Amino acid sequence: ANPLYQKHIISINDLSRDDLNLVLATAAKLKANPQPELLKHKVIASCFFEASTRTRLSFQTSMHRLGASVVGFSDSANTSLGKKGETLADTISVISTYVDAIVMRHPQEGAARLATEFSGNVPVLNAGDGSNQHPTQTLLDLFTIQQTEGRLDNLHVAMVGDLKYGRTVHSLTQALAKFDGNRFYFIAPDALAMPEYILDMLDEKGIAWSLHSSIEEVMAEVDILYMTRVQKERLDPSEYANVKAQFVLRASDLHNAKANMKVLHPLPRVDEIATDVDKTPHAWYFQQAGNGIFARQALLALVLNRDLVL
Amino acid sequence: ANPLYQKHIISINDLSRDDLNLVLATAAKLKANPQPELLKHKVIASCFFEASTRTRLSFQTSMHRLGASVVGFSDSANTSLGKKGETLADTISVISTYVDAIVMRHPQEGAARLATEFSGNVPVLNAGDGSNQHPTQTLLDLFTIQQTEGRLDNLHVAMVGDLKYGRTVHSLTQALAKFDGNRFYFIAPDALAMPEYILDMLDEKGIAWSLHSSIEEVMAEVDILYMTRVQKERLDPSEYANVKAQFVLRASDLHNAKANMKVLHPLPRVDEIATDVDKTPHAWYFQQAGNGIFARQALLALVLNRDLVL
Amino acid sequence: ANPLYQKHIISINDLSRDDLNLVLATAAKLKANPQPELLKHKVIASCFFEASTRTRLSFQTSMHRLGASVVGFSDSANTSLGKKGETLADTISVISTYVDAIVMRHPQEGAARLATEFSGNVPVLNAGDGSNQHPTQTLLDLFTIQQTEGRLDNLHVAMVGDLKYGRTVHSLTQALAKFDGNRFYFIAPDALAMPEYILDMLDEKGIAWSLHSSIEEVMAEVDILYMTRVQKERLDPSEYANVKAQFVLRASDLHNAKANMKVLHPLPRVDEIATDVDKTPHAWYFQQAGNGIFARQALLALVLNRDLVL
Amino acid sequence: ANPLYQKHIISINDLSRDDLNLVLATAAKLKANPQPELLKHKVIASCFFEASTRTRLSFQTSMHRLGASVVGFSDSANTSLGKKGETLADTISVISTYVDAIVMRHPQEGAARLATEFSGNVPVLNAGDGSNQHPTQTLLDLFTIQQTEGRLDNLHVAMVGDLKYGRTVHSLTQALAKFDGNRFYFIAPDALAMPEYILDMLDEKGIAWSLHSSIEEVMAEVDILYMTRVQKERLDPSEYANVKAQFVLRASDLHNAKANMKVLHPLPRVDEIATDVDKTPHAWYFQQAGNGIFARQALLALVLNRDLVL
Amino acid sequence: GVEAIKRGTVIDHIPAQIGFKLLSLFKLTETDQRITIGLNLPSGEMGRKDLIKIENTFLSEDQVDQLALYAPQATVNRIDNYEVVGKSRPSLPERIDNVLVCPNSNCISHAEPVSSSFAVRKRANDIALKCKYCEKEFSHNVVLAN
Amino acid sequence: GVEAIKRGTVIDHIPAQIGFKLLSLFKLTETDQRITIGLNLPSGEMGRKDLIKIENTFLSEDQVDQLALYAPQATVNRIDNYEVVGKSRPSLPERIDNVLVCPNSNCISHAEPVSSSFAVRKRANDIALKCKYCEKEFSHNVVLAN
Numbered sequence A, B, C, D: 001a002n003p004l005y006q007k008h009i010i011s012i013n014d015l016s017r018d019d020l021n022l023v024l025a026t027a028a029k030l031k032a033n034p035q036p037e038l039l040k041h042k043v044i045a046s047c048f049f050e051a052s053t054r055t056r057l058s059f060q061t062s063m064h065r066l067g068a069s070v071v072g073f074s075d076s077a078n079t080s081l082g083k084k085g086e087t088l089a090d091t092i093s094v095i096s097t098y099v100d101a102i103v104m105r106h107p108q109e110g111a112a113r114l115a116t117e118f119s120g121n122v123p124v125l126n127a128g129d130g131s132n133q134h135p136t137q138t139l140l141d142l143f144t145i146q147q148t149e150g151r152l153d154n155l156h157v158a159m160v161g162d163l164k165y166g167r168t169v170h171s172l173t174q175a176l177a178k179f180d181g182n183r184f185y186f187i188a189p190d191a192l193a194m195p196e197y198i199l200d201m202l203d204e205k206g207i208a209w210s211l212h213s214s215i216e217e218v219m220a221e222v223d224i225l226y227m228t229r230v231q232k233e234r235l236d237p238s239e240y241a242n243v244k245a246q247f248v249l250r251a252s253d254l255h256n257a258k259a260n261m262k263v264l265h266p267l268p269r270v271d272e273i274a275t276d277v278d279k280t281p282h283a284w285y286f287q288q289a290g291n292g293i294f295a296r297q298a299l300l301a302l303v304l305n306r307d308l309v310l
Numbered sequence E, F: 001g002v003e004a005i006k007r008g009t010v011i012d013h014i015p016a017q018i019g020f021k022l023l024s025l026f027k028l029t030e031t032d033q034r035i036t037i038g039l040n041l042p043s044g045e046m047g048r049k050d051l052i053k054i055e056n057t058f059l060s061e062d063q064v065d066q067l068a069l070y071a072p073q074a075t076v077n078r079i080d081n082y083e084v085v086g087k088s089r090p091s092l093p094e095r096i097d098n099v100l101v102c103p104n105s106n107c108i109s110h111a112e113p114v115s116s117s118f119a120v121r122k123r124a125n126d127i128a129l130k131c132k133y134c135e136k137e138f139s140h141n142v143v144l145a146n
């Protein structure tokens, strides 16, 4: 039996360094040697209560690349869903009667772990539950860093953008904090800063981090540069715009960057990575997005197959 | 290798008489001898940014009839799509990472050819981009005329309705203008008339056309009668309604029609072809719609398979 | 009892040159001397079922400038009982039981005249009904012609823009065709050309008109340049954006203009009269907008006062 | 001609302590003696493009309490010509052709001052423009400080809540920083702390301010407790719901309060001042709300009357 | 005059009010090379012109032809040592990329990270320029009217 | 350098990659008289400079100050009959009009037929430009950038 067989995947905080490795391992095998009828005859609900089409297109593509059937919805707009008195608990109790695995994204925190209480023997994969978790994104990011950097230990990772509200930067800092010798550079306005609970955690596990004022002081040193969507609407119109310089990345800046360095972004990217960066060997956020197929595949393969032989 | 292998299909103006023939050829073979696992293991995004469910139901059915998996959306209503700062270029760059072929319909002109700049090696099939192109409709119409008329040379084709805004009549006149000896009858109000650029084109390539006042003067002569949706809202309430007679077709009218003659309509049909016509041997717009499966199939087969053996 | 007292004012077509003149005369009077209490203790309905800025605030300000009270509504979304079963007939039946006069703008042609059959002896005043009438606009357009030009006979008036669907350019021709010596230059897209009926009428009375294609083609003959709003939606984006130098006005154009020439627009505008036309002395549409008050005043004065001995 | 006659009232920043005082003096007067016909035969525009309860019904009731007539609108959805092409410039151009004064609330900062350049000599009165100004609110906040406290010099005023985005707490500081001896306690989330510029200004004039963290930290020094509305949306649910005992007020707190202390709120409220604060004698926000009328009256009296000899 | 260079390009004979337009569009100025621009120069010989001279810079082939919709009568001339080693006049190209904007307001070119391309077809009494993207043909007058 | 005109202005030691911007922004080019521009010259120190000469034109007084944010050490020479009848450097104006764009996007400037106006304060260090309409203040870095 495999350590993740039939496990619900709800939070990065729940997975171990080993669990992480095994998932990044399998992602690599499957990316190399495809398994198109692995999950023949399985049906997975893809329940996106909140619509978020890149995570969804990725997950359903992954499910199809293993042989599975997909049923589900894309609500938020609305279907006969999320309303009038039907609880999520009675909704999950019915779909688990139907399908082999529930992949679900919800507007509210804690929903996939609530899903877990009612899903019987059917595994629940969290595709984001409010501001809380999104493991599956952290997983592709880890496989992208592992594939480009050869390692998940001992790296120089800079975190740029809104680190306050970044549910992505928060899990990658906690996932990466399980391996060793990593140095973190946080580069945010003081207003959109990396939380104390994160910083406690880090200092507590003995890890080196520093706040910096410009991408610029860090560039010489960095291995991974993870950009983040600033929510323009999470600051005043005059406050976003007013910096001095800004927190946008343009190709010029990258002149001091190491040959191994990559720029990573969860996307949508709007103001923050200038399109001239795309032409650079450093830009790697589309290829990252692409690794979403293999890490996501990996997941479903390990959750649904007892002893996966590869 | 086949002449259309891995070719994007964006405009009729881009295809040749030969390319046309090859696609109409294969449509015929596949309609006769089905190939249900031809495209096993391929995933096609079906991206309908603008919703248009008959072209879409046709295309996804076609993809399923060849063995493929489909992922995608039906926006316009909306999903997490088409907004807030994500460009079509960053959207196409991510889905091409996922899928084997992009079928896409967009509200704006030029979008599928823009898609082409960012889709890497993944082929892009245009399912309509504003008032500009819709090749795949022209293709089923050509296979319908070829199947009912035995030929694509030397025909009497009348074009009825709004020929001003008809993106369908405009491509069928340019597609048909590649074969020879065809005579065109345009029957529109002077207000919803066939454009000069079209007429230039025709006169320039040496082709006979004439404006006529009633379906009625043409009926004796015609081979194909292609009806068109008048946009009731593209004229004044009193202007649509006021003609003298009208531009609606009823079974009575067809009494002088040739045995080979067919009535073709891209659908939705609302005011313009009276339901008594449906009972006639001439009515052929549902069967046309049906040929949408084979011509569309044909396309994906030639774009995705190197040397198709049939 | 003046010749307009307790009369309904629905169509320009139902008013004589004689009535038109008594309206302009009165306007002029009220304009010279404010009578703040003429309509004291009258209550007037503003019923805008279709809602609208200058005509609504113009009439309500007129009612106040004369002493009357206003009760009312605006709509297109909802507000009160009327969409199903509350027929305009039933709504007028009950409102003519409450107020001394009804001014109404409604989306459907014929609405104020239908209103006339349910308002008992409460007059109704057409603030626009569909694409049909807007007699009130016309009265201020003629007061601005009479006021800048000194007469309404023997003028060179150009109509530019949508001369086809334009409700105002139709009525304005109707009215000017009741005074002698007027020549009419029509500069529209031929796609948006003046209807035949208006030209047939004009041919009857031996009035001289002519089609034109550049405003520059007549910008040396004209005393009035009536400028109308084209609406994007009707024409194709590539259709509208074409046409050499378009039918817009820029100050440069005004360089060979007669001194006495005035540029009028019924308002709103969007690109058609450039901002530079504005600080020229020919610019007269915000003035015309202002003249809406006294013209409007004049009508409520005459309909609601037995004789105005002003 | 009093020092505010036919003046525009756009920013607190453009008014002197001298003007501020003449406004408060007049308010007081009108409050003691109603002059129901001061503005007889004036017509005033209420233009709320952003729509709003107390400031709208407060000003319209002021206009009525003084004799004037109101014409107008409210919006955020639609109602009348303005969204495309009808520029605020063009709308003010035409409305200043109709009324004697414009009071306008608009969503975009700078709107009333832009209005000022298109209203000829019709004054405009800022009812709020974006996150910028709301000088009218401020005038009633100072009349309620002067009226409960007897002065506007040498006060201990606390600002609580969102001191960062709060349009009103900014102007109120601006104004109070024009009278001598005022000490300012600032009790906000540091996340929502008072901007630097306001503190830099305050440092210039040698005015004493200080950051604080419990209302209980100063609830024994203070004469005015200005309470502002936090808006949920800006902060994370778990962020806002945290912070020990929050920045809300409960009557218990008022137990060591000076007798003369008054709790003020610009209104609306939702959780921040508990209902129990209400029957305490310190509660003064519905009163302040009421004072909106006379302060509002005062301004329309002064802008529209050559000298008020009241 | 604006004349004596030992090497470079000299766009002579530019119609007046266009040289600035040319430096703007074709981005002649972003360089740290000596450029001498002369605007509204005497030019009685040909009315009133503009003149641009860039030292140690040679505009090749494609570039001179891109000037054709703007200054169709201008004279490029190269200089390799202190004298006029060649002459060139703009020929109307098959395509014009990067510089013009599409008249079509629903064309995707309008918000995407892409350069415009128009194909040139001198037809009858003007040039028609069909857009890459929307495939709509417009007279250069409309395209240039902007 | 380049030499003599008579009765015209000559603005010397523009930075380099700035002289064109001044030609664009300040619309100096839309003239009938001979303008000559030297870009990437030397003739007066600090290595790099563009130079602009507009004959029979004089940039009277607050027009020279409007150059200060871009060429603060520029020298503006009033020339008459081949000699410098006066020389002034730019000084910081109280207000910069027409050429800047308000950094704040909920500002009304962006949609209306109004010209920008920024009041100016602090000198040869940070300079805060405050908007006429939205009244927000910004560092000149921010305003003179995106």
Ligand SMILES: [Zn+2]
Binding pocket: B110, E102, E103, E104, E107, E108, E109, E131, E132, E133, E134, E135, E136
């Ligand atoms: Zn285009």
Ligand SMILES: [Zn+2]
Binding pocket: D110, F102, F103, F104, F107, F108, F109, F131, F132, F133, F134, F135, F136
């Ligand atoms: Zn601003």
